Structures are given as C-alpha cells and as structure tokens.
Design a protein around this ligand. Structure first.
Ligand SMILES: Nc1ccn([C@@H]2O[C@H](COP(=O)(O)O)[C@@H](O)[C@H]2O)c(=O)n1
Ligand SMILES: Nc1ccn([C@@H]2O[C@H](COP(=O)(O)O)[C@@H](O)[C@H]2O)c(=O)n1
Ligand SMILES: [Zn+2]
Ligand SMILES: [Zn+2]
Ligand SMILES: [Zn+2]
Lengths: 154, 159, 149
C-alpha cells in the first residue's frame, strides 16, 4: 500500500523541417517539434521519475550515452530505473494540447506504444486530446504541450 | 487495492453575449465562456480527469463537439453521465481536486456553491471535493482576461 | 485505505529588485518573484496541492514566510487526520539554472513536512522560449500530493 503519485509537464516549439512525433506516432504535418522532442512521452517520463522520487528527465537523459536515442527508448529506460527503485506502475493518464493537427485518430496508437513501453495492460494507460481554443502560443499553434500523471506502488 | 489517478485540463474564451457558468454556478458577469455546450470549464476538466482515471478516453470522445444534442448542454448533466460510465467500468470515485484560473470576476464567493454542485453530481460527501480559485498574476492571455482555465485531479478505485 | 490526491498551481512575475526564493532557497539572480509574501512559487503550489488533497481549500483561505506557511499547512493536514505519503512538483523557468538548487529545495520541503527525502521530488523545466515563461517574465510551479486518512 506504499502508493506514490507523479506529475509531468513538457512543451516544445512547432517548427518546419522536423517530423511530428507524439506518443511514438509520426503524424503527417507541415511542422514538427524541436531528442525526437516527443512531448507526450517526456511528460510521462517526468511523471514516472517524479513518482519514484528519482529527479527528472533532464538529469537522467541530458545532452551528454543516450545520443540519438528516441523518446520510446528513453521511456523504457525510465521504466527500468523505476522498477530497479522497487516500484510497480499502476496507471498513467495524460493530455496533449495542440490546436492542430487532429490527434483523436492517433490516440489508440499512442496508448499501445506507451502500454508496450511500460509493460502495462492497455486499460491502465490513457491519453486525452485538447485544443487551446485559439488562446495563447498553443492556440496560435506555436507549440504543443503535454501533461501527465502516474501512480506507482512500492 | 486497485487505485487509479486521472488529470484534466480545459480552457474557454471569454466573450460577450454568453452566460458565465463555472462549476454549475451561473455567475453575474458581462461576458461568458464560449463553447458548443454551456462551456463549463471546471466541470469539463473534472470530467476529463474522471474519464482519464478510468482509462475511458476523454470528454470529446464521450460527448462530441459536433452533435446538436450537446449544443448548449448542461455540463452538470454531462458530469453525471461521466460518473455513471466510470461506475459502469467498475470504478468508485474517491476524491476530486481542482483549480480555476481567471483575472475576473471574483470566484471566491462562488467556490462553496461549485463544490456543492460537484459533490451532488458525483454523489460524494463535501469533504471529498475541493475547488481552488486563482488569478494568473497578470500573466499571458489569462492575465489579459481573454479566457478562463481549469485544472483537475481525480482518484478512483476499481471495485 | 482512504487515499486522496491534490494538485497545486502557482505563478508569479519576475521583477527587479526582489530576491529569488524557490523551495525556500535564495538563488542569485537579477530579478525575483513578485507577491504579497516572499512569493515562493514552488512552496505555494505544494501548499495548495496538500490543502486540495485534504479538501481544506487553498492557502488564500487559511492565512510569516512560505516555509512557515508550509509548516502550518502540514499542521492543518494532520489535524484533519491525514498523513502525507508523497509530493511531486515541477518548476518552469527559462532562467536561471535550477538543477544545482533542487536538492536543497527538497531538503527544505522534507523538513517542513516531516517526510523522508525519498518521498519528496522537485523537477525543473524550461518553457522552450514559449510564452511569458519563455521570455522570462514569470516562473510557474506545479505540484501533486498524495495523502491518506
Ligand atoms: N531553469 C531551469 C530549467 C531546467 N533546468 C534543468 O535542465 C534540464 C533540461 O530542461 P528542459 O528539458 O526543460 O529543456 C531539466 O531537466 C532541468 O533539470 C535547470 O537547471 N534550470
Ligand atoms: N489536437 C486535438 C485537440 C482535440 N481533439 C479532439 O477534439 C475534441 C475537441 O477538442 P477540445 O475539447 O480541445 O476542443 C477533443 O476531445 C479531442 O479529443 C483532437 O482530435 N485533436
Ligand atoms: Zn521534451
Ligand atoms: Zn470545455
Ligand atoms: Zn504564490
């Protein structure tokens, strides 16, 4: 019954000349995020480190071994370290905030990737999608934000 | 036992001509929130949190933005239906916490009413429901009064 | 068991010439956070997350610096019959570098809450040069807290 909660936040700029990868899914778009800059996976990664009280993603996977590694590999490495700390992942919930493109047709693909990387049943992983209602830098489409929550148990 | 956590987020534009409804409370104000339904930013975030905890997807999947029945829909009715589907999935709600962010109007006089509405809708005692009011300290679009944001967290358990 | 979760949010403008205090740690900087108190954005967010979890409202409902207020928050939480299990948090700041001060923050929080270090976590992020946070006009903090009655 030694439960712990963690929360995660990430945001990246939307720029031309980059692929758009969210939840490990390459989504056809005129711009991508400036890592593979996978905003969803980084937020989930941070939430997991947070729940296990192991610091944050920048400390574990800096700009100094993990060069060229995609965010799915970083998530798998995160999960491994959480497990070595003696914690089991119970569930993950998340929200992506993007004005465009449409993300709903890609939700299930994202869930399956995350579930596989965390060795979780599909019914313990959730991904939600929101616009920012044309408000702020998100609403003007300058970037994409992700929020995450994770529950673990020792 | 089988606990699950969920988180929710929502934001709506503030515009003339619309009623301002937050946490089911109609608040006297010259502007209101713009959306397909009554645009109740707080109830939508709580809703998303509850679907999220139960891994049922999100508010848009369950109550489509493109349906004339949900045009001007009572978000309290949406919250109650959400709660019903979470229960059908086999989950009991343990607690909800939430934040509302607005430059204006003052929301503190209405927090108790919001909490009561949420508690009733979810069939929870008052001490399992919390709503916190904030400003954005004059920063960004929220500081410029362009819209209102809500954040929510919910804990459930698979019965 | 009667677990409860809470979530906290806070943001303050960066102005001259106030000192920069985050997680009870004074950090050398040309600007500092503007508020009625010491404007400790991290501690305010944690404080609200804890009041949220115990359903005791928020900070601007009950009430000395932010550390004293966090200590008072912990008192009211225990009074209501709750024990704190863990806190997680994120500071969003484009500048200055927060990594060197993270473990001191965490020490402060653990002491004020009477928790061992391994139940307290603080994470730092930039805003990738986006918005008011990206232009260094303010600093935001987010927090989550798990309690049990
Ligand atoms: N103001 C800040 C922001 C981030 N950081 C550190 O730099 C790392 C990378 O930051 P981002 O991933 O937000 O670009 C973070 O994990 C954090 O530890 C810092 O030391 N001071
Ligand atoms: N980028 C986005 C944002 C929202 N959506 C979907 O459209 C529905 C309406 O979006 P919002 O609720 O943010 O207006 C959402 O539930 C979301 O699932 C999407 O498919 N892609
Ligand atoms: Zn990232
Ligand atoms: Zn909404
Ligand atoms: Zn504050």
């Amino acid at each position: 019954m030694d439960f712990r909660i963690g929360q995660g936040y990430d945001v990246h700029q939307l720029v031309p000349g980059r692929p758009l990868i969210i939840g490990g899914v390459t989504i056809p778009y005129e711009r991508g995020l400036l890592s593979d800059a996978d905003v969803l996976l980084h937020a989930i990664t941070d939430a997991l480190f947070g729940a296990a009280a192991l610091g944050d993603i920048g400390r574990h996977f800096s700009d100094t071994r993990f060069k060229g590694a995609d965010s799915r590999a970083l998530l798998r490495e995160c999960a491994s370290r959480v497990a070595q700390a003696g914690f089991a992942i119970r569930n993950v919930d998340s929200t992506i905030i993007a004005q465009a493109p449409k993300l709903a047709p890609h939700i299930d693909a994202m869930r399956a990737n995350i579930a596989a990387d965390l060795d979780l049943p599909l019914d313990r992983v959730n991904v939600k999608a929101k616009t920012n209602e044309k408000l702020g830098y998100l609403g003007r489409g300058e970037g994409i934000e992700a929020q995450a929550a994770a529950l673990v148990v020792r």
